[PDB]
């Protein structure tokens, strides 16, 4: 039941070499389904909560999904959807403010 992290510990050895030498071998038993912890410490001091980490992960996703749609594909129907959604949300928030301005 020896774990994979205390099995191989050395220099780069590009991933396919490790796959060939350690786990693709048929003589192995394939125990040790223990994953590892990949999130760093410099990313926990500033986002110290799964909620805050998820919010940041969503903010950067919403930004990337704007930078890619801003060689001449020029239609990229996802881009037209993302422009229609923004131009709809703008009008909707403006009318939501204006209506309650009028209700007084």
């Amino acid at each position: 039941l020896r774990d994979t992290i205390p099995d191989c510990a050395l220099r780069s050895q590009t991933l396919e070499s490790l796959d060939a030498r350690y786990v693709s071998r048929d003589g192995a038993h394939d125990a040790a389904v223990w994953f590892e912890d990949m999130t760093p410490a410099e990313l926990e001091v500033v986002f110290p909560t799964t909620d805050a980490k998820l919010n940041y992960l969503s903010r950067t996703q919403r930004l990337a999904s704007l930078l890619t749609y801003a060689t001449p594909d020029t239609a990229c129907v996802h881009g037209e959807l993302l422009a229609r959604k923004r131009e709809r949300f703008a009008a909707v928030i403006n009318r939501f403010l204006d209506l309650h301005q009028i209700l007084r």
Binding site: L1, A32, V33, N94
Partner: protein, 585 residues
């Protein structure tokens, strides 16, 4: 109950305790696994799939499991049984085991609640009695119609929240499963929890065939809960039928009743739930109002008073006929209400949308612009006189003339529109009717449009650099030209005035009229799309001289628009907007 009795599954992990959470059935997982409904809604259903009894999995569900939720191939189970985790942290094994077994003990304690045993004895007994189509079996199928399932959901989701309050989330999920409607937004399931809901079933569709089994099984399963009931003409058939079925599929020694009055079902204890009948005129919790279109006063007072209670759900299941479909007592309620009454109709709003709900009809018994867009349109109007910076500097005016008098289709339509942000806004409307036998119909029409424009100009001074005017010439080219000429001259008393011009076929002349033909379908198509998405609105200070002595101009326009499938104003509005090839000076 099988998935509740599972051992620890040691299952070591690397995430710090400051993040990990305890999902039931499984060990301790990172907090992200509680935010993703992809895994949460699976680890939550494979567990509640054990509380659901074996008589509520379906007709064909598998041997001894809900095979469409818990099925592992005979090769994947043998390849999974050889998977082994880190299995431990000796200083950290005991707390995780304690937490997991504590959550599972909470679940098991939920399994043993008497009030939950009653809800099970209700839903299981109902799905079992329904197998025989509610015959007199002591205890080809009896499929429920749609509303005959909505009534059951309305009763069960209420009595669940009333009898079992300390288990809101768990019983909510259990009922979502048992009705075979999982992945339902909690807004709908919450709507099921409301009281005082109204039904409207057509006769001979089945309302008493389903009520008396509902009444009988809401009596015999639950304990100590009364059940109201009221009708105008003295309920005797339903009462005798309830007596019959209860004495049939339960011990007749248990039922005790006096004719036309309280029926009571016995129990080992002194629970003795009752069906006291209020037809002949405390805590009821159902108050099944069986007829709600024929009530006499001094009998509505008990119903208005029971609304003051917090445990009664007055169900207004009342029949309709379609000869009196617009009941003087309920069909008006659909005006000012929100998720209160649900009609059971097969010929919907229009004269013949029946082909839509045709397949929905019982087998035994054998609008271009959306309303929301119209309500939003009239409901919200932007103030143009104070948001002039949002407007484009061009006005577009379309005149759709009719050159007759003393006719209902003799109205001239005029619209003055512009761009507002990237949307379109109406500044003025006219529905103008020639005085009979005037000598100057074009000038009368011109004076009407000029007066409208002027008012719009005065309300927004300095806003507009251009006004572009189209006079439809389909009716008469000469008469359209005459209108343009009078508009031209009168406006000569700043913004530049430009007319749309047309070079008629075979001609080299550019006339100041507009010919409506090939551009109609694109114009209408674009309008419908824009209007429906909230992109066309009316100015809060919209101008109209001709619609100022009987109805609101926007309300009037909307009545014409709702004929899309006298149209002068609709055409002018749609075409003015379409206009907003180059028109010129």
């Amino acid at each position: 109950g099988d998935a509740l009795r599972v051992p620890f599954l040691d299952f070591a992990t690397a995430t710090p305790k400051r993040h990990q959470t305890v999902v039931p059935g499984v060990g301790t997982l990172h907090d992200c696994c509680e935010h993703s409904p992809l895994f949460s809604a699976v680890a939550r259903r494979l567990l509640f799939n054990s509380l659901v009894p074996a008589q509520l999995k379906g007709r064909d569900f598998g041997g001894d499991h809900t095979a469409k939720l818990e099925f592992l191939a005979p090769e994947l189970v043998r390849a999974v049984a050889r998977l082994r985790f880190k299995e431990c942290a000796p200083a950290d094994v005991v707390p995780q085991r304690n937490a997991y077994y504590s959550v599972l003990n909470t679940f098991q304690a939920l399994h043993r609640s008497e009030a939950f045993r009653q809800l099970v004895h209700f839903v299981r007994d109902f799905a079992q009695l329904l197998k025989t189509s509610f015959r007199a079996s002591s205890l080809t199928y009896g499929t429920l119609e749609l509303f005959q399932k909505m009534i059951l959901m309305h009763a069960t989701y209420f009595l669940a929240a009333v009898l079992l309050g300390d288990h809101a989330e768990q019983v909510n999920t259990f009922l979502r499963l048992v009705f075979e409607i999982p992945l339902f937004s909690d807004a709908a399931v919450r709507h099921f929890r409301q009281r005082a809901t109204v039904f409207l079933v057509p006769r001979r569709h089945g309302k008493t065939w389903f009520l008396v089994p509902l009444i009988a099984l809401s009596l015999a399963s639950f304990r100590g809960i009364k059940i109201g009931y009221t009708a105008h003409i003295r309920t005797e058939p339903v009462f005798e039928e309830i007596d019959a079925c209860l004495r049939g599929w339960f011990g007749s020694a248990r039922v005790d009743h006096v004719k036309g009055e309280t029926i009571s079902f016995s129990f080992p204890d002194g629970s003795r739930s009752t069906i006291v009948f209020a037809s002949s005129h405390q805590d009821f919790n159902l108050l099944f109002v069986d007829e709600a279109n024929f009530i006499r006063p001094d009998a509505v007072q008990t119903i208005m008073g029971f609304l003051n209670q917090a445990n009664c759900k007055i169900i207004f299941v009342s029949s309709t006929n379609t000869g009196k479909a617009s009941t003087s007592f309920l069909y008006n309620l659909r005006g000012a209400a929100d998720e209160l009454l649900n009609v059971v109709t097969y010929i919907c709003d229009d004269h013949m949308p029946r082909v839509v709900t045709h397949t929905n009809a019982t087998a035994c018994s054998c609008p271009v612009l959306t309303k929301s867009a119209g309500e939003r349109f009239l409901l919200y109007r932007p103030s143009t006189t104070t948001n002039s910076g949002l407007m484009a500097p061009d006005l577009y005016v379309y005149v759709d003339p009719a050159f007759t008098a003393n006719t209902r289709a003799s109205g001239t339509g005029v619209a003055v529109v512009g761009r507002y942000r990237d949307d379109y806004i109406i500044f003025a409307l006219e529905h103008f009717f020639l005085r009979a036998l005037t000598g100057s119909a074009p000038a009368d029409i011109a004076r009407c449009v000029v007066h409208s424009l002027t008012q719009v100009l005065a309300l927004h001074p300095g806003a507009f650099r251009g006004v572009r005017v189209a006079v439809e010439g389909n009716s008469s080219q000469d008469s359209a030209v005459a209108i343009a000429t009078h508009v031209h001259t009168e406006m000569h008393r700043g913004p530049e005035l430009l007319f749309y011009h047309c070079e008629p076929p075979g001609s080299a002349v550019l006339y100041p009229f507009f010919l409506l033909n090939k551009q109609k379908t694109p114009a209408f198509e674009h309008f419908i799309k824009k209007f429906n998405s909230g992109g066309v609105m009316a100015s809060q200070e919209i101008v109209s001289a001709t619609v100022r002595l009987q109805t609101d101009p926007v309300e009037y326009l909307l009545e014409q628009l709702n004929n899309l499938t006298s149209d002068d104003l609709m055409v002018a509005v749609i075409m003015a907007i379409y206009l907003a090839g180059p028109p010129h000076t």
